[PDB]
Amino acid sequence: PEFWRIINGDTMKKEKNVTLLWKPLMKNDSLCSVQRYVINHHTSCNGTWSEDVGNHTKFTFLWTEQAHTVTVLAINSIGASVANFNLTFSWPMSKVNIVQSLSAYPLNSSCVIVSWILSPSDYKLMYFIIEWKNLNEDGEIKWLRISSSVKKYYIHDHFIPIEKYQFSLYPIFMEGVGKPKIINSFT
Amino acid sequence: YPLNSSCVIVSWILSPSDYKLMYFIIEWKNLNEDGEIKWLRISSSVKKYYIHDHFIPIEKYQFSLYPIFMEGVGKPKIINSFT
Ligand SMILES: *[C@@H]1O[C@H](CO)[C@@H](O)[C@H](O)[C@H]1NC(C)=O
Ligand SMILES: *[C@@H]1O[C@H](CO)[C@@H](O)[C@H](O)[C@H]1NC(C)=O
Ligand SMILES: *[C@@H]1O[C@H](CO)[C@@H](O)[C@H](O)[C@H]1NC(C)=O
Ligand SMILES: *[C@@H]1O[C@H](CO)[C@@H](O)[C@H](O)[C@H]1NC(C)=O
Numbered sequence: 345p346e347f348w349r350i351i352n353g354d355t356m357k358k359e360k361n362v363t364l365l366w367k368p369l370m371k372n373d374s375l376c377s378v379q380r381y382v383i384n385h386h387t388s389c390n391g392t393w394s395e396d397v398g399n400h401t402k403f404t405f406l407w408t409e410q411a412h413t414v415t416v417l418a419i420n421s422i423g424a425s426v427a428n429f430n431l432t433f434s435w436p437m438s439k440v441n442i443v444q445s446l447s448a449y450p451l452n453s454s455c456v457i458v459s460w461i462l463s464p465s466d467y468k469l470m471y472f473i474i475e476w477k478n479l480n481e482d483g484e485i486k487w488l489r490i491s492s493s494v495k496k497y498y499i500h501d502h503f504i505p506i507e508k509y510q511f512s513l514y515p516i517f518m519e520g521v522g523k524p525k526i527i528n529s530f531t
Numbered sequence: 532y533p534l535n536s537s538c539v540i541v542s543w544i545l546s547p548s549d550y551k552l553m554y555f556i557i558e559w560k561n562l563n564e565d566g567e568i569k570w571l572r573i574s575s576s577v578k579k580y581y582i583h584d585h586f587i588p589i590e591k592y593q594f595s596l597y598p599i600f601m602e603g604v605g606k607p608k609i610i611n612s613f614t
Binding site: 447449457459 | 536587588589
């Protein structure tokens with residue numbers, strides 16, 4: 345699976361609610377069928393266990409402490425997956441910004457232009473998240489994972505000219521997720 | 532200058548000379564990416580051209596108008612920045 349973290353809370357509060365969302369596996373990716381999914385959490389106590397999420401697409405947790413790591417193992421009847429995606433949460437690196445600017449323009453109803461300019465940083469940079477949402481209705485969040493090597497990508501999605509949309513870019517580092525950049529419209 | 536995302540209008544001016552000119556070739560090339568060179572034909576009777584194609588307004592595009600006389604190609608003319 346490819347999980348995605350949703351946060352619904354104030355930045356001032358030290359405890360944040362994190363929701364995990366993943367796109368259902370396809371026939372080839374899961375090698376066919378996976379009967380049940382499991383999510384494991386990493387704790388400073390180093391407790392090894394398993395938590396069963398079910399076929400439900402939503403899972404919620406409350407993050408308070410420093411070092412937390414989540415791994416979504418897709419256990420099949422044969423066994424468990426060997427390679428999984430990875431993400432970290434912590435405070436100090438959530439303020440550093442490496443991307444100063446970005447712009448978004450509409451081509452038509454099928455594609456959107458996004459460009460960004462960033463600056464070199466001491467830590468290694470590998471990949472980025474770009475997602476979009478609608479303010480007219482509080483629907484589901486649509487997101488995509490892109491590489492940091494290429495500075496230019498066209499979003500292929502439906503877009504209503506009348507409705508006003510929100511775009512945002514999340515940076516990813518080994519230490520965690522940095523300061524998110526959210527764009528409203530032309531300014 | 533681009534009228535919108537799908538139309539660009541170019542303008543020029545000519546002066547009398549001993550040689551005569553027959554047609555013009557409109558050529559453009561991108562800066563950041565090394566894309567294929569696109570060229571178009573135009574006669575000298577009409578002074579305006581409405582280039583219609585898919586364009587991305589954000590990036591700069593380099594334009595070039597070249598003249599033709601009895602002896603062939605003349606001095607290249609380069610347009611680097613949008614007006
Ligand atoms: C997170 O997972 C990736 C790949 O699954 C791995 O390369 C990396 O070392 C992991 N990080 C930690 C802190 O376990
Ligand atoms: C929108 O533009 C894209 C190219 O950016 C093109 O593939 C698509 O066909 C266009 N939409 C329509 C409805 O023609
Ligand atoms: C741009 O202008 C040209 C010339 O009138 C027109 O054909 C075209 O429909 C216009 N494009 C848009 C997106 O309005
Ligand atoms: C092409 O050939 C014709 C006849 O040989 C000549 O009149 C014409 O000038 C030539 N074209 C050019 C560009 O010289």
